[PDB]
């Protein structure tokens, strides 16, 4: 397994430089931490209008002003 | 039905393969630094 | 035959691109979203050969919107009839289509 | 006022390319432990300006074309390709602000392979029309990784907004995340303007030895306005340059000093190597530079998304 | 010795210089004394032809503040 | 006269084909293929498909037509084109002159006169264009249409190697 | 519309500069030539392996066609599934080049 | 007159920049190449002088026909010449070019390449030195700075 | 409808019959082919553009991808009689009628 591999660095590490690139790019976004983060970050961009809600009289979770304490809020944002 | 404009008409070889009915030379004269000097080059090359 | 691998398996794999009234990136809505969802919630389960009587109305709305003739035809109309005037001399433009006025906003 | 721009932009991409000429001597001069060209102006300054003058009242050939249309059609789509790529270069601000430059300057030096292609067609001789198909061979093939290595940079970038690749550069050089792109890609664009090691067009004649002094000039100086181009695209790809808004000049200065360095290098490059055989670049395109760039690419693609980094779409 | 080159490329960097001082004092100029206003996307550009109505002169860059409403 | 600047480049599209279509040579069937290419692809950026302009350039023209152009150099070293050509000039140029003369006309569909800048929408897209963003939906929403593409270049890798071996 | 009249401002001045060159110097009555290669007359030969390299170059512009909405596409929020449908692609290109690689059809010109 | 003035700067405008940029063709054919290599080295340069060598016949000025000129390359000769752009200049360079030098009497030498091409500048030697071959090239410079073609086109 | 609509089927229309009835070139049929994919890439564009329906923009670059490489495919066939008969003159293209 390492016979191999020291014959292949020795003669092609280009290619060698490239499976292991390769190989990393794969399987390394299912073990980072910070993958959750980039859906995060991707979602919390409003790119449309928040198009408020009709008060029917019993929503809680739904805030009536940007400066109310309920809502989602991006302060995992600010600090990371 | 071999009809007057149907007459030339051989049938098919029996394999189903025609026949299939040379390489380059080129002549480097005297018009050439790389070459050291005076040198005509008669190539023949496949490629 | 159409065999319709997609609902057998429950899986969406062309349904989307299909019409206009979907689910577009960023709730972006066509320009006939409309008309089109009008029309598709009519023709609804009835079948073609009643949809292509039963919503004759909101499918005609929906081409209209598609390709704006009728709308073309009454701006040519009106167009036509302001070159007339114009050349005999009846009508002047004022002053808020001659561009004289400093719009609104 | 907006002519006036054009035109301080195109005059001015003529003079650096004539005043090139004269670097290129010199400083290939010197590191050949020579000098170049002295006499004809002070310190060789009136050199570009008495060859041009001697290329413009030589005889042209008018040969027996196989098209005489498409031997007028080469120099004027050189030299309006090798123009029109400079008009999205923010430095700091460009002539034409558009959201897609990057791609636009790809598509634009995508079509240039049809000045080497014509001017192979329209020479009789079918061993310049041989020269001039491994030409179009080598350019279409480094422009694959061209396209790749800038596509994993604008994956750090956001857009295809050449200004906003100052933006993403505010803090550090892309050349630190992206040396591995920046190298190969600089050698790619060596290999895009058929620039040495990756010359094929003086030894085995090239696709341009049909043209004599009236056109030749022409593409010649095209080729340069793409040389500096390519290099002033890197210098804002890789080593982007501080922007005060309040002072663009500070940028201006600092790009151009880059680009300058950068075009240097090249000619610091063909005055250091042999050239390649051609199936030996072809070796370096197709088996080292397209697997590392195949790699590379995935490594920008996934990299983004594992650091939680993805650039903004503004 | 090699400070002969520098010429050449001091007459070349002044060549490269020109365009970028050029189309920055060109975009002062046409603009109010301002950068040329970058509208990639249709919100930057109906900002802006909302300026140029609102200015009241026909161009985008003549500014209007408080002073403008009551 | 600027307003009808589609419509201009579209008569140019129509003559650039029938530049082609006669059919003189390949070599000039090509030229007259890339200067349509141009002039179409100016049609589609004057719509605001800026990406999709970027694309004729770079993989109709820069990618697609320098093939052709290429095998046109190596494998292939009037009355009837000149006549087709003019041909369909007089018929091209006799249509603008109907279409003009009438705002309205009919060949197979009924067409207006008019420019196409009454067709148009009035709003505004925020911060992206549509066109961009539909196109990045290729690899959200577009999976099986990936799927099917990748698997068709790499079966035209495979069916190219195929076929150019004649063995 | 300004960008129109950069395009147009290069091409004539390209054409201005190419007219010039092509004729001050007819100016010039220098002399009649009658001049009456490394091939003499021979027909160019077919060069397969040109052909095949491009071909292979337009094929993978293809895959670059397919590959360029990428910075536009890491913006997406089903960053799973486009994640893995980049990753896909671009393994496909490297498909498609080990494919050419292993055939023996970059060869001559490697 | 005024016209003459303006005739006469053209002239020292156009002659100025023929001779402050000849290009020679990278060509040799015996012994004077190595010398004319020399003049080509970093002592001399000839590249300070705007003298630059060129593969091609197409652009090139100057045909240096340095060294022996036999009967079996002569038609060669004649077709590097004849594939020159005008305006097109010939130094000879060395003995055997001049006038045969050493293979004078030999049935395979052309006794003279001013048999085959004309000669502007003969450069004298076996092998002329490097030094000499940069003097008969500033000495093809000032015959080229003493042309009269635009005061003769006016004139005639 | 719209006018540029009616210019973009002419040119198809041309290029389709420029294929049909000429008996030249093979790589001439092969320019009135891709000249027919043109017309309809400039089509399909002008349409969803049109429209605002923005799923179908990813449509044009599939309907260019896949129809490029049906060219390539095509070269090589022409490639293929390249290397049989010397030319691609669609009447060397006869073995089959009997
Ligand atoms: C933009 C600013 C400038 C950029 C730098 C460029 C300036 C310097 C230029 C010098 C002169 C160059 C002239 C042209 C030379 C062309 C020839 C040449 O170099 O060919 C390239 C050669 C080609 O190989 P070769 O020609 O040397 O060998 C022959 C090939 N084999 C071996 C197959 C027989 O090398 C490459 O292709 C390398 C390209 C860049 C590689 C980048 C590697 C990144 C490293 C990643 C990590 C690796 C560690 C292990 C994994 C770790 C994981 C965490
Ligand atoms: C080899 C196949 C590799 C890709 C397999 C599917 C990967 C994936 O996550 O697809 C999700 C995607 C999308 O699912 P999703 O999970 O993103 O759904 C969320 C809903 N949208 C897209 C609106 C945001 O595709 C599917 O689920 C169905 C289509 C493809 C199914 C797999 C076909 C394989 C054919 C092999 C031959
Ligand atoms: C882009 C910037 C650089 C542009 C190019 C350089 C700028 C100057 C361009 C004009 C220079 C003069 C004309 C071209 C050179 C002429 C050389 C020559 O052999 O001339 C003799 C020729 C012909 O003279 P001739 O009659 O002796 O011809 C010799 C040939 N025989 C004897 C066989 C007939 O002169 C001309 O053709 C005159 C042309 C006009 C000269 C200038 C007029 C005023 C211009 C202001
Ligand atoms: C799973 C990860 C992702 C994988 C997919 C993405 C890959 C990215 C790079 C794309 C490359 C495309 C082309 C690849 C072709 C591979 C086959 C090959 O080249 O075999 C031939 C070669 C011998 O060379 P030869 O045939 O003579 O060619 C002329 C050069 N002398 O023989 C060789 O070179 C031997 C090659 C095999 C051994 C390579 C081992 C590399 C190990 C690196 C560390 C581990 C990486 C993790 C993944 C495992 C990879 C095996
Ligand atoms: C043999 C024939 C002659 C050969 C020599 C001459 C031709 C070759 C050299 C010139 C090439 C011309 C290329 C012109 C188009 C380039 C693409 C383009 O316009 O991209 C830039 C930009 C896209 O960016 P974006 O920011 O989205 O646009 C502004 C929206 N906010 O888009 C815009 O800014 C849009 C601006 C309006 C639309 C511009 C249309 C330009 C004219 C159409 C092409 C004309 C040339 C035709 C021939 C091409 C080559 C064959
Ligand atoms: C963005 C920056 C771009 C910069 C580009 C330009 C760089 C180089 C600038 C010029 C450098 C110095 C040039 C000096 C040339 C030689 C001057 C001279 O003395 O020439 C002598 C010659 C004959 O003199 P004569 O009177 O006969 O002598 C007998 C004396 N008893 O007399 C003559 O030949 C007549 C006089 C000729 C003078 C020519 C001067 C150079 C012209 C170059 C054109 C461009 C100038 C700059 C343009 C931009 C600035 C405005
Ligand atoms: C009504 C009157 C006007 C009529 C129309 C004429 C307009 C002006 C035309 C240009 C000037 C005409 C005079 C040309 C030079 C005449 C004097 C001369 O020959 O001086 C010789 C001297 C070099 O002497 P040399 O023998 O070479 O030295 C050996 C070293 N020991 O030479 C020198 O020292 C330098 C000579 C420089 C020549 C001028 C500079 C080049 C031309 C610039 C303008 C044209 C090109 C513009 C830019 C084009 C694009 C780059
Ligand atoms: C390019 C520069 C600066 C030098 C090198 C050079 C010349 C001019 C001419 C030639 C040349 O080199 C080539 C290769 O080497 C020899 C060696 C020769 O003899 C040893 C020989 O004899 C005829 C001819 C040649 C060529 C020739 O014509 O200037
Ligand atoms: C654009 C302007 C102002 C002039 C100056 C100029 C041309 C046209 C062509 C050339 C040129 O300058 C130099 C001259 O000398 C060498 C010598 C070379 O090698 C000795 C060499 O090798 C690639 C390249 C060259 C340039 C070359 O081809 O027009
Ligand atoms: S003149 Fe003399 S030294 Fe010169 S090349 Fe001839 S034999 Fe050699």
């Given at each position: ?80 | ?47 | ?105 | ?314 | ?70 | ?167 | 519309?300004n960008l129109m009249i950069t395009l147009l401002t290069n091409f004539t001045l390209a054409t201005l500069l190419v007219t010039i060159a092509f004729w001050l110097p007819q100016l010039n009555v220098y002399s009649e030539k009658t001049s009456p290669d490394p091939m003499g007359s021979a027909r160019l030969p077919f060069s397969m392996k040109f052909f095949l390299v491009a071909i292979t170059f337009l094929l993978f512009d293809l895959e670059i066609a397919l590959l360029l909405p990428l910075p536009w596409a890491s913006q997406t929020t089903n960053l799973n599934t486009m994640l893995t449908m980049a990753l896909l692609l671009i393994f496909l290109l490297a498909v498609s080049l080990a494919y050419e690689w292993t055939q023996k059809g970059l060869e001559w010109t490697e | 007159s005024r016209g003459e003035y303006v005739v006469a700067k053209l002239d020292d405008l156009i002659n100025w920049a023929r001779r402050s940029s000849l290009w020679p063709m990278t060509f040799g054919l015996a012994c004077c190449a190595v010398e004319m290599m020399h003049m080509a080295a970093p002592r001399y340069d000839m590249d300070r002088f705007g003298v630059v060598f060129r593969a091609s016949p197409r652009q090139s000025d100057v045909m240096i026909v340095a060294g022996t000129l036999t009967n079996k390359m002569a038609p060669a000769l004649r077709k590097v010449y004849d594939q020159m752009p005008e305006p097109r200049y010939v130094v000879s360079m060395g003995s055997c070019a001049n006038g045969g030098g050493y293979y004078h009497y030999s049935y395979s030498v052309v006794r003279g390449c001013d048999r085959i091409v004309p000669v502007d500048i003969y450069v004298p030697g076996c092998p002329p030195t490097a030094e000499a071959l940069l003097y008969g090239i500033l000495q093809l410079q000032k015959k080229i700075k003493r042309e009269k073609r635009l005061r003769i086109w006016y004139?005639? | ?98």
């Amino acid at each position: 397994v390492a016979a191999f591999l020291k014959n292949v660095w020795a003669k092609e590490p280009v290619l060698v430089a490239s499976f292991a690139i390769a190989g990393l790019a794969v399987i390394l976004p299912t073990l980072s931490p910070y993958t959750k983060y980039s859906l995060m970050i991707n979602r919390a961009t409003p790119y449309n209008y928040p198009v408020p809600l009709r008060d029917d009289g019993n929503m809680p979770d739904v805030p009536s002003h940007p400066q109310d304490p309920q809502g989602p809020s991006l302060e995992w944002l600010k600090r990371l | 039905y071999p009809t007057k404009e149907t007459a030339h008409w051989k049938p098919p070889p029996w394999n189903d393969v025609d026949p299939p009915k040379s390489n380059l030379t080129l002549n480097f004269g005297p018009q050439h630094p790389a070459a050291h000097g005076v040198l005509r080059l008669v190539m023949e090359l496949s490629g | 035959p159409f065999f319709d691998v997609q609902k057998k398996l429950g899986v969406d794999l062309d349904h989307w691109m299909t019409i206009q009234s979907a689910e577009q990136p960023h709730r972006i809505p066509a320009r006939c979203h409309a008309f089109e969802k009008e029309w598709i919630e009519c023709a609804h389960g009835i079948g073609s050969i009643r949809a292509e009587k039963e919503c004759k109305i909101e499918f005609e709305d929906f081409r209209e919107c598609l390709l704006r003739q009728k709308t073309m035809k009454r701006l040519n109309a009106i167009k036509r009839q302001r070159d007339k005037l114009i050349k005999e001399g009846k009508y002047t433009p004022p002053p808020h289509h001659s561009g004289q006025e400093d719009l609104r906003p | 006022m907006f002519m006036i721009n054009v035109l301080t932009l195109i005059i001015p991409i003529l003079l650096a390319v004539a005043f090139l000429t004269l670097v290129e001597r010199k400083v290939l001069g010197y590191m050949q432990f020579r000098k170049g060209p002295n006499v004809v102006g002070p310190y060789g300054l009136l050199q570009p300006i008495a060859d041009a003058i001697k290329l413009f009242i030589k005889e042209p050939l008018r040969p027996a074309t196989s098209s005489i249309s498409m031997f007028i059609l080469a120099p004027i789509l050189a030299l309006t390709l090798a123009l029109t790529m400079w008009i999205p270069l923010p430095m700091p601000y460009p002539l034409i602000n558009m959201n897609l430059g990057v791609l636009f300057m790809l598509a634009m030096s995508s079509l240039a392979v049809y000045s080497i292609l014509w001017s192979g067609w329209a020479s009789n001789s079918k061993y310049a029309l041989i020269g001039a198909l491994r030409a179009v061979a080598q350019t279409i093939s480094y422009e694959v990784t061209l396209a790749i290595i800038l596509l994993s940079v604008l994956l750090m970038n956001g857009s295809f907004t050449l200004s906003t690749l100052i933006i993403t550069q505010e803090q550090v050089w892309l050349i630190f995340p992206a040396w591995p792109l920046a190298m190969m890609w600089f050698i790619s664009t060596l290999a895009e303007t058929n620039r040495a090691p990756f010359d094929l067009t003086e030894g085995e004649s090239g696709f341009n030895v049909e043209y004599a002094a009236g056109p030749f000039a022409l593409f010649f100086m095209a080729e340069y306005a793409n040389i500096i181009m390519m290099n002033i695209f890197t210098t804002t790809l890789f080593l982007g340059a501080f922007h005060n808004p309040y002072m663009p000049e500070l940028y201006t200065i600092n790009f151009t000093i880059k680009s300058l360095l950068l075009s240097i290098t090249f000619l610091w490059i063909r005055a250091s190597y042999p050239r390649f055989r051609y199936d030996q670049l072809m070796h370096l395109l197709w088996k080292n530079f397209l697997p590392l760039t195949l790699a590379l690419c995935m490594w920008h693609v996934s990299l983004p998304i594992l650091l939680s980094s993805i650039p903004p779409q503004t | 010795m090699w400070f002969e080159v520098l010429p050449g490329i001091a007459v070349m960097g002044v060549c490269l210089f020109i365009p970028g001082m050029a189309t920055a004092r060109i975009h002062r100029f046409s603009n109010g004394g301002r950068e040329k206003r970058v509208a990639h996307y249709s919100y930057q550009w109906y900002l802006m032809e909302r300026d140029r109505r609102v200015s009241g002169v026909n161009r985008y860059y003549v500014s209007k503040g408080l002073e403008n409403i009551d | 006269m600027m307003t009808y600047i589609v419509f201009i480049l579209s008569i140019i599209f129509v003559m650039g084909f029938v530049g082609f279509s006669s059919k003189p040579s390949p070599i000039y069937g090509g030229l007259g293929l890339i200067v349509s290419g141009g002039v179409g692809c100016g049609i589609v950026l004057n719509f605001g498909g800026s990406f999709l302009g970027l694309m004729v350039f770079l993989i109709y023209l820069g990618g697609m037509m320098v093939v052709f152009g290429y095998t046109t150099a190596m494998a292939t070293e009037n009355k009837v084109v000149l006549g087709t050509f003019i041909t369909g000039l007089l018929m091209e140029f006799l249509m603008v002159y109907y279409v003009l003369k009438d705002k309205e006309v009919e060949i197979v569909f009924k067409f207006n006169g008019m420019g196409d800048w009454v067709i148009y929408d009035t709003g505004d897209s925020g911060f992206f264009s549509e066109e961009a963003m539909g196109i990045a939906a290729l690899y959200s929403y577009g999976t099986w249409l990936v799927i099917v593409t990748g698997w068709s270049l790499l079966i035209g890798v495979v069916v190219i190697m195929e076929i150019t071996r004649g063995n | 519309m300004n960008l129109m009249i950069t395009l147009l401002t290069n091409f004539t001045l390209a054409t201005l500069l190419v007219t010039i060159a092509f004729w001050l110097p007819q100016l010039n009555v220098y002399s009649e030539k009658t001049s009456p290669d490394p091939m003499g007359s021979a027909r160019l030969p077919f060069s397969m392996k040109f052909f095949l390299v491009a071909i292979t170059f337009l094929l993978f512009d293809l895959e670059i066609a397919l590959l360029l909405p990428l910075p536009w596409a890491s913006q997406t929020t089903n960053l799973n599934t486009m994640l893995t449908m980049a990753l896909l692609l671009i393994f496909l290109l490297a498909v498609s080049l080990a494919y050419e690689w292993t055939q023996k059809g970059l060869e001559w010109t490697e | 007159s005024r016209g003459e003035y303006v005739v006469a700067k053209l002239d020292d405008l156009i002659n100025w920049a023929r001779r402050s940029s000849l290009w020679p063709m990278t060509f040799g054919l015996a012994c004077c190449a190595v010398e004319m290599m020399h003049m080509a080295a970093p002592r001399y340069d000839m590249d300070r002088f705007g003298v630059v060598f060129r593969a091609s016949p197409r652009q090139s000025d100057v045909m240096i026909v340095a060294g022996t000129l036999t009967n079996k390359m002569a038609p060669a000769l004649r077709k590097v010449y004849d594939q020159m752009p005008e305006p097109r200049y010939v130094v000879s360079m060395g003995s055997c070019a001049n006038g045969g030098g050493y293979y004078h009497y030999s049935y395979s030498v052309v006794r003279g390449c001013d048999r085959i091409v004309p000669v502007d500048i003969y450069v004298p030697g076996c092998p002329p030195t490097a030094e000499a071959l940069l003097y008969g090239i500033l000495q093809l410079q000032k015959k080229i700075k003493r042309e009269k073609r635009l005061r003769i086109w006016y004139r005639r | 409808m719209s006018l540029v609509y009616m210019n973009i089927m002419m040119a198809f229309t041309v290029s389709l019959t420029g294929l049909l009835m000429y008996r030249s070139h093979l790589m001439s049929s092969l320019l009135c082919l891709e000249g027919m994919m043109l017309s309809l890439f400039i089509l399909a564009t002008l349409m969803i553009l049109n429209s605002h329906f923005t799923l179908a923009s990813m449509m044009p670059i599939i309907l260019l991808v896949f129809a490029a490489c049906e060219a390539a495919l095509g070269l090589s066939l022409l490639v293929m009689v390249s290397n049989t008969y010397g030319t691609d003159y669609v009447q060397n293209l006869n073995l089959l009628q009997c």
